[PDB]
């Protein structure tokens, strides 16, 4: 009874020979081709522009720290930024940043010269690395730097940026020291007054336009990612797939997760109302999160499979009958396809000539074996 619809009728009626008539042997169902998912335009963007594009940055010894959470980390703007000169990530692939989730994101921003950019990395040495900004050995994040001569330098020399020249001990990882105590370089106490063995721990950077890229100010923003056991608060925004019409798919509109086919509609909804229901409390139509339109949702076409056969002792040919479904969503198709109100019957040649009714189909259509 998997061979042919006539064999299916034999299977259902449990008899080798079946009398002339109509019998319901099975039911037809349109399996959805694929699944579709759409999400609205994301507005919970992380304040990347606030941290990266800020008018005033603090000094390297007083680097500002910004905690980022409960938002989507859109690195696309970072990728499209062509002014970046250094983009090195430790413990994470730069192309995998949008595909990875982190419990918390910390943004560190400061201004340093061109030749000190290489000092902002795990395991590095130097004045900035040891006295101004130190990274841990297992640091997970990315280091971003770019030229900032146009904004952090002026004609008269911008000394507003300072670095910790002298410190008694190297800075611990992720430690910000802003102490202005007089450095004691000798046995003689300073007592708050600089002298032969006493110097200020901070030195003002001399920024001039003609210094050169080797000695030009650079805006550096460091993003640190930590993976803890707490639920993640920073995740890449979801991607909205292309909208589909007139084709049965699986749609998940922000939790509707329904099945069927979406078709253009004419009804108008409330400005706030998104999706509607029928009398039977079932899904009826959903509004596009992207655009502003209403799409009717009829369930995927399905119905019983009927077989029209004459007496097996008289003939051996059968015609499939697909009720309640049009011929488009369809023995295989292509053999005298005919459509009626009852459905799409396949395997019989429609004729205008009118005879007395023999076999029931529905809607005034009767089939019989003749020439």
């Amino acid at each position, epitope marked *: 009874c998997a061979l042919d619809p006539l064999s299916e009728t034999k299977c259902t009626l449990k008899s080798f020979t079946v009398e002339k008539g109509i019998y319901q042997t099975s039911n037809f169902r349109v399996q959805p081709t694929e699944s579709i998912v759409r999400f609205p335009n994301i507005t919970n963007l992380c304040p990347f522009g606030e941290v990266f594009n800020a008018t005033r940055f603090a000094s390297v010894y007083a680097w500002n720290r910004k905690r980022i959470s409960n938002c989507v980390a859109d690195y*696309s703007v970072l990728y499209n930024s062509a002014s970046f000169s250094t*983009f090195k990530c430790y*413990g994470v692939s*730069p*192309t995998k940043l949008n595909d990875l989730c982190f419990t918390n994101v910390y943004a560190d921003s400061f201004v340093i010269r061109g030749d000190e950019v290489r000092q902002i990395a795990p395991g590095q040495t130097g004045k900035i690395a040891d006295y101004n900004y130190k990274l841990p050995d297992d640091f997970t994040g990315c280091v971003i730097a770019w030229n900032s001569n146009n904004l952090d330098s002026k004609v008269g020399g911008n000394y507003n940026y300072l670095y910790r020249l002298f410190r008694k001990s190297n800075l611990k990882p992720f430690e910000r020291d802003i102490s202005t105590e007089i450095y004691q370089a000798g046995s003689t106490p300073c007592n708050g007054v600089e002298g032969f063995n006493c110097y200020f721990p901070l030195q003002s950077y001399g920024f001039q336009p003609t210094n050169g890229v080797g000695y030009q100010p650079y805006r550096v923003v460091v993003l640190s990612f930590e993976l803890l056991h707490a639920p993640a608060t920073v995740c890449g925004p979801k991607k909205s797939t292309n909208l589909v019409k007139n084709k049965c798919v699986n749609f998940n509109f922000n939790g509707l997760t329904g099945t069927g086919v979406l078709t253009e509609s004419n009804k108008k909804f409330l400005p706030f109302q998104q999706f509607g229901r029928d009398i039977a409390d079932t899904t009826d139509a959903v509004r596009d999160p992207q655009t502003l339109e209403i799409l009717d949702i009829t369930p995927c076409s399905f119905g019983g499979v009927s077989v029209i056969t004459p007496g097996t002792n008289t003939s051996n040919q059968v015609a499939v009958l697909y009720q309640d479904v049009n011929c488009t969503e369809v023995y295989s198709t292509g053999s005298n396809v005919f459509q009626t109100r009852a459905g799409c019957l396949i395997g019989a040649e429609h004729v205008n000539n009118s005879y007395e009714c023999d076999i029931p189909i529905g809607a005034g259509i009767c089939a019989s074996y003749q020439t």
Partner: antibody, heavy 122, light 110 residues
């Protein structure tokens, strides 16, 4: 200026372990990653792992996770590659290279290469 | 794991002619307009030498004859003219996602 050196050849008994060096010079060792590539005689190139000398961060290939135990010595600016449970399939030439790992510049490009070491297991 | 196939495996090019090497990627390598495909030349008995980085830029010290193109799955490297000392093995490498893998390699004959 930049010189990267590897031992000429190494011979190891089957079932033993071999630890070979990757000596880099002419540039700041800690500022550049050290990557490793395996090339079977007459075959293509296979990646093993990459390490950053600063902090000792490691990233091992899934195929060579149980085979490659990689450590570096920043004092001598030399990277040590250790192989364990060697079989006849592990007889190949291993090359250590460097990459800056900058999305802006060169990404994973391997501009400089070492002379390599012909490892024979017999 | 992205697998890279290089065709033709064996190529013969006369003096001054053009050599065509194509590397195919099983998965897309382009990322925001950046293609991470590298071409390496390995002389016999010597380590491979990088020629083209990011599949479109010439490495310093590499002659201008070597040139690359292609994007996404398909990448093409063109060498013109081809000299006598070009006999080596050319490898294409992808680095968009770990683990990084290399191509099968091609043989150039004069």
């Amino acid at each position: 200026q930049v010189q990267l050196q590897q031992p000429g050849a190494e011979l190891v008994k089957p079932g033993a372990s071999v630890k070979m060096s990757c000596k880099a010079s002419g540039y700041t060792f800690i500022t550049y990653w050290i990557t490793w590539v395996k090339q079977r005689p007459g075959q293509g190139l296979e990646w093993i792992g990459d390490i950053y000398p600063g902090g000792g961060r490691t990233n091992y290939n899934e195929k060579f996770k149980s085979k490659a135990t990689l450590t570096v010595d920043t004092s001598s600016s030399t990277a040590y590659m250790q192989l364990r449970s060697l079989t006849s399939e592990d007889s190949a030439v291993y090359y250590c290279a460097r990459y800056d790992g900058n999305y802006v510049g060169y990404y994973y490009a391997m501009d400089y290469w070492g002379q390599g070491t012909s490892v024979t297991v017999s | 794991d992205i697998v890279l196939t290089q065709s033709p495996v064996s190529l013969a090019v006369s003096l001054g002619q053009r050599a065509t090497i194509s590397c195919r990627a099983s998965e897309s390598v382009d990322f925001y307009g950046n293609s991470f495909i590298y071409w390496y030349q390995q002389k016999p008995g010597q380590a491979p030498k990088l020629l083209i980085y990011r599949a479109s830029n010439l490495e310093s010290g590499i002659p201008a004859r070597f040139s690359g193109s292609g994007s996404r799955t398909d990448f093409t490297l063109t060498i013109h003219p081809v000299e006598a000392d070009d006999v080596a093995t050319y490898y294409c490498q992808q680095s968009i996602e770990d683990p990084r893998t290399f191509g099968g390699g091609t043989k150039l004959e004069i």
